[PDB]
């Protein structure tokens, strides 16, 4: 090519968006922002395809510019905004707040959070950066360059930031036994405690995660995101709670739900 | 011994002309559990492409092979043998790839047939992209 | 030989054709932005310091 890509094919869209292929040849190309293209979910998909308020793309265009959608403390009027992990999309008209949390599968789950829960979110830091005048810096998953952080926050800890002020409240130390959120891969959407850390110099470190039901599994540290200390989470949890119980009993639960109600 | 070219070769990091009343030789660790050799610390060789006294960083894959040629100066040629599985005929085939690996003169006694351990880094030349990390002695050869 | 005359102190301009060559020696063989006296172009043109700015060829 001779420059950056601007279009996006419907076939080339990621599988967790669950967009049907019979509608259009193209897919909503996400705009650049604090999250990457693949694991984010555009605001047009969250409204038209997830919540079904809107039918067509022009209908999404009008609603976003009525200034009724407030993503994580700032109103964005772009239909293809890269809404990443746990962006607190707050809707003022109906008094309803959405935080983008993964389901037990790889898809984003439509999770309604309480308004007092909407003021804070958990961000995973990436590096401790020294500024031009001996200024410590932290860079979160959504590229929040927070100067003067708490000095005990390390490379892969998570900070409970506050949305209306843009500053942190607490932080969770990366240690074994703490709760975790597997953000990526085949174990995408899993919730479990951390049981073992394996060191690999040069290569990628892999961390074993014990599930709440005792289904221990491994995951590299790049797709690992702690969510709380011990067995106590710091946010609300969707139904399923990230277990990935095997497909033999989703056959059982789906069959039992139909016959019980009739 | 040294300085046999047109220019003045020296370690760029250190300063060797401070006011007075040996040389403060520069050397760095390499990582991955690799022990820096004694001759690099105490020797008088200076080379910008040495993994210990030069500005090269070891990253990526770590491989191993057998040295076959040493007529080239400051760089050598190693040999790596492997078998490729053919799915039609359930057999293999002997295939070899002889890449060029830089030999820092810190390793002094290196003989043809020694099983060398190399390390990936930035491309030193048109074909050289690997540097010697340790020299394991060949089998036997007590004499 | 059409002459697009322009007088900047009044802002008017008209096209006047001249049909003799002996009056054009004071315009031929000269470059741009030269202060030329137009004393030979006619009886009404005397003491007229005219600057030549160039126009269009016979091919336009």
């Amino acid at each position: 090519a001779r420059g950056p890509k601007k279009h996006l094919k419907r076939v080339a869209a990621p599988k967790h968006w669950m967009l049907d292929k019979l509608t259009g040849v193209f897919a909503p190309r996400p705009s650049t922002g604090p999250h990457k293209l693949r694991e984010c979910l555009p605001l047009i998909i969250f409204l038209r395809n997830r919540l079904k308020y809107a039918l067509t793309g022009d209908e999404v265009k009008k609603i976003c510019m009525q200034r009724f959608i407030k993503i994580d403390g700032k109103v964005r009027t772009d239909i293809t905004y890269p809404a990443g992990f746990m962006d607190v999309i707050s809707i003022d008209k109906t008094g309803e707040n959405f935080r983008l949390i993964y389901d037990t599968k790889g898809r984003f789950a439509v999770h309604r959070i309480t308004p007092e829960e909407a003021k804070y979110k958990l961000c995973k830091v990436r590096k401790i950066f020294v500024g031009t005048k001996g200024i410590p810096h932290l860079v979160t998953h959504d590229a929040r360059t927070i100067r003067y952080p708490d000095p005990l926050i390390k490379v892969n800890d998570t900070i409970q930031i506050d949305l209306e002020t843009g500053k942190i409240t607490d932080f969770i130390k990366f240690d074994t036994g703490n709760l975790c959120m597997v953000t990526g891969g085949a174990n995408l959407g899993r919730i479990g405690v951390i049981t073992n850390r394996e060191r690999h110099p040069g290569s990628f470190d892999v961390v074993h995660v014990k599930d709440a039901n005792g289904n221990s599994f491994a995951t590299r540290l790049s797709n690992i995101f702690v969510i709380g200390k011990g067995n106590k989470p710091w946010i609300s949890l969707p139904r399923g709670k990230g277990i990935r119980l095997t497909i033999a009993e989703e056959r059982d639960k789906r069959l039992a739900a139909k016959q019980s109600s009739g | 011994d040294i300085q046999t070219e047109r220019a003045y070769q020296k370690q760029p990091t250190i300063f060797q002309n401070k006011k007075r009343v040996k040389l403060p030789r520069y050397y760095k660790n390499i990582g991955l559990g690799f022990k820096t050799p004694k001759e690099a610390i105490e020797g008088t060789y200076i080379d910008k492409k040495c993994p210990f006294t030069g500005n090269v960083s070891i990253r990526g894959r770590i491989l191993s092979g057998v040295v076959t040629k040493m007529k080239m100066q400051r760089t050598i040629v190693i040999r790596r043998d492997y078998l490729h599985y053919i799915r039609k005929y359930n057999r293999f085939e002997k295939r070899h790839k002889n890449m060029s690996v830089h030999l820092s003169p810190c390793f002094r006694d290196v003989q043809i047939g020694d099983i060398v351990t190399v390390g990936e880094c930035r491309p030193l030349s048109k074909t050289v992209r690997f540097n010697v990390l340790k020299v394991t002695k060949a089998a036997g050869t007590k004499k | 030989m059409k002459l697009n005359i322009s007088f900047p102190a009044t802002g008017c301009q008209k096209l006047i054709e001249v049909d003799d060559e002996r009056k054009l020696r004071t315009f031929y063989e000269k470059r741009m932005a030269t202060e030329v006296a137009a004393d030979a172009l006619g009886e009404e043109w005397k003491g007229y310091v005219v600057r030549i700015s160039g126009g269009n060829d016979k091919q336009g």
Partner: protein, 206 residues
């Protein structure tokens, strides 16, 4: 134009590559700067990423450094004596990185005569007529004289470095790359570094 491409030449084994595309814009190469001695004539050129590179063509001064005394000053370059890469860059006096050039000594000589205030250069027989350094040699405070007298513990200089101070022409090596950033900074040859090219310059003369 002249390009920087690896696929235009042979393989490692010696086979010939066959091109599958024409010349790309990111493989671009430009003609050399080849800056000389003269008044400051530096041409800025746009490079990849919308940045700027300073193509120097004539340079006169440079911020050379004297690392033993931890001092650096701007001095005018006068001559080029040695270049390790090529001998035609000495005859055609061209400045590139790692060139042995000649500079005036007065910017560094006055610093010795101000901060230490001792006679350097100054072949015996003639005294300073402006009298400014003579004033600076004497007339110190009594409490600062002891601090001044401790400056003479390290006021010794090597004979070879002192020898080029006699004629006023110091040998110095270019450290900055001139055709890219536009400057001609560097450092003064000292000790083992200085005595190496003195053997080579004598070998150049014979």
């Amino acid at each position: 134009g002249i390009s920087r491409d690896n696929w235009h030449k042979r393989r490692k084994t010696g086979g010939k590559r066959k091109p599958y595309h024409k010349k790309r814009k990111y493989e671009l190469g430009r003609p050399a700067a080849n800056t000389k001695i003269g008044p400051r004539r530096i041409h800025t050129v746009r490079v990849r990423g919308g940045n700027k590179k300073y193509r120097a063509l004539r340079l006169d001064v440079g911020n050379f450094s004297w690392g033993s005394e931890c001092c650096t000053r701007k001095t005018r370059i006068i001559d080029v004596v040695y270049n390790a890469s090529n001998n035609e860059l000495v005859r055609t006096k061209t400045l590139v990185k790692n060139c042995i050039v000649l500079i005036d000594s007065t910017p560094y000589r006055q610093w010795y005569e101000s901060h230490y205030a001792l006679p350097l250069g100054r072949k015996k027989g003639a005294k300073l007529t402006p009298e400014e350094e003579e004033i600076l040699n004497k007339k110190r405070s009594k409490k600062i004289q002891k601090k001044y007298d401790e400056r003479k513990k390290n006021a010794k200089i090597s004979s070879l470095l002192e020898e080029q101070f006699q004629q006023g022409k110091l040998l110095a090596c270019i450290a900055s790359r001139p055709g890219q950033c536009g400057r001609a900074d560097g450092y003064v040859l000292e000790g083992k570094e200085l005595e190496f090219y003195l053997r080579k310059i004598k070998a150049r003369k014979g």
